[PDB]
């Protein structure tokens, strides 16, 4: 590839990843203006490139913010995963009387491969559905648990 | 605390985390039915607890799926962060002619503290706005970059 081709495919890679993430506050984020020279109404091959490199560097701050937000969600999901595991030990300890079903570890492995095999719209939808069904299940359980 | 109180506060902790994450496919997710004994129409202190422990264990599979999805988004955001850094080196190397502005590292540290200090609705909104402004900025830049 050449210079303009590596630029094109590198930007195409970044743009695809942004769409994968997307599924009052008066903040100043870099935008493209007419005087910046990136328009046909005054196209400057150098003035535009100065604005591009400047805007991306001024955008690089908010990219670190996004990684902190998505890491917080990763730490959030891992916390719900472990807090449920403790909730199992709490309930079985209070029971102490066991007709208990435990899922098959290899059946779960076959399901996780199938859940992640479908495309991104189905997986974003699956993530959307799992959250609602589990919260509704806990609210129904907690209500009956408080009646004791 | 007592037995029923530790159950209540542990579930309250899990339910809060699920709402923090929430901002065709025919999947079988555990639900609460009338015969399960968790309703007033037939309330069984033991039959309900058997369904609770069973449903949560059968839910524990889909909790591992959620952690894989949010980790994928964390790896996705970190990839956009590093791919932009390479895009800077690509553009400056093609320029080679420098009236370049580089942001202040401590000014960015003051902003990141303020961006994360606001509540979750503002931060989910800020995450929403940063993604749109950066993709629109790249599409405007790439268009002018292809005209060269």
């Amino acid at each position, epitope marked *: *590839l*050449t210079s*303009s*081709e590596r630029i*094109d*495919k590198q*930007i*195409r890679y970044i*743009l*695809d990843g942004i*769409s994968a993430l997307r599924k009052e506050n008066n903040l100043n984020l870099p935008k*493209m203006a007419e005087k910046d020279g*990136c*328009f*046909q*109404s005054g196209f400057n091959e150098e003035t535009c490139l100065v604005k591009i490199i400047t805007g991306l560097l001024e955008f690089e701050v908010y990219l670190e913010y996004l990684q902190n937000r998505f890491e917080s969600s990763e730490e959030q999901a891992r916390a719900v995963q472990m807090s449920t595991k403790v909730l199992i030990q709490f309930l079985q300890k209070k029971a102490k009387n066991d007709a208990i079903t435990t899922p098959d570890p290899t059946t779960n492995a076959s399901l996780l491969t199938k859940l992640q095999a479908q495309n991104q719209w189905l997986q974003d939808m699956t993530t959307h559905l799992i959250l609602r069904s589990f919260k509704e299940f806990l609210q129904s359980s907690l209500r009956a648990l408080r009646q004791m | 605390l007592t037995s029923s109180e530790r159950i209540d506060k542990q579930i309250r902790y899990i339910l809060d985390g699920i709402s923090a994450l929430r901002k065709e496919n025919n999947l079988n997710l555990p639900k609460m039915a009338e015969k399960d004994g968790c309703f007033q129409s037939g309330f069984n202190e033991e039959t309900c607890l058997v369904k609770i422990i069973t449903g949560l264990l059968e839910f524990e599979v889909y909790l591992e799926y959620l952690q894989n999805r949010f980790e994928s988004s964390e790896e996705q955001a970190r990839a956009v962060q590093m791919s932009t850094k390479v895009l800077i080196q690509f553009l400056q190397k093609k320029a080679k002619n420098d009236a370049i502005t580089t942001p202040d590292p401590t000014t960015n540290a003051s902003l990141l503290t303020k961006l994360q200090a606001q509540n979750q609705w503002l931060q989910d909104m800020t995450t929403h706005l940063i993604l*749109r402004s950066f*993709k*629109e900025f*790249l*599409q*405007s830049s*790439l*268009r002018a970059l*292809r*005209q*060269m």
Partner: antibody
Amino acid sequence: QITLKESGPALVKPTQTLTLTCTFSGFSLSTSGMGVGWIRQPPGKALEWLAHIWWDDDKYYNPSLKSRLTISKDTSKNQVVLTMTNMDPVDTATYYCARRANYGTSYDYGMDYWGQGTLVTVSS
Amino acid sequence: DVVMTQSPSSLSASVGDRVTITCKASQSVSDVLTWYQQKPGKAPKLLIYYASNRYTGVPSRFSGSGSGTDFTLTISSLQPEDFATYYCQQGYRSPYTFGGGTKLEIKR
């Protein structure tokens, strides 16, 4: 459902204004990476790209016809208008408007949605 | 600014035959090239995008290839349904120039 439909006169006198209007439905021209272009085809001839307008009003034209070409948009009515003045019989053609979407991504299909096309005859 | 040239301008093949249509660019447009199929009078129908990636619904017998300045559209086993004119468009830089088009005729 995505629909683009051209509207305009089927007959224009020589040296008289031609006003074409493309009305679309199913997408917003204010969406990032979205754009609408104009392409014409003289009877039995090859295609010729005319003009294009992007979401940020950065208008582009074919360099040969920019003198008589003015494109503009109204995102509140979903309308893109291409205006040709001082029409000549050489510019009689079927005029299409097409949708360009997801410009920089791997889903830049190109002109993936077209209209039926309006046959424009120029004669007194 | 950019000139696309197609060869041949016309072609005639049998049913079940293979068709080869080429398109050249005056300057590199990377893989950002798009093929269209046009029936008489009707608006063009999208076939290939990004040189070698197939648009939704297009039969598997249509396959494009190439990059830079050499591009080729291939119809494996020709059906009589494929009677049309095939066009070549570069989407890299304005003007988004079309090719001359290749008129495909069916033999019998």
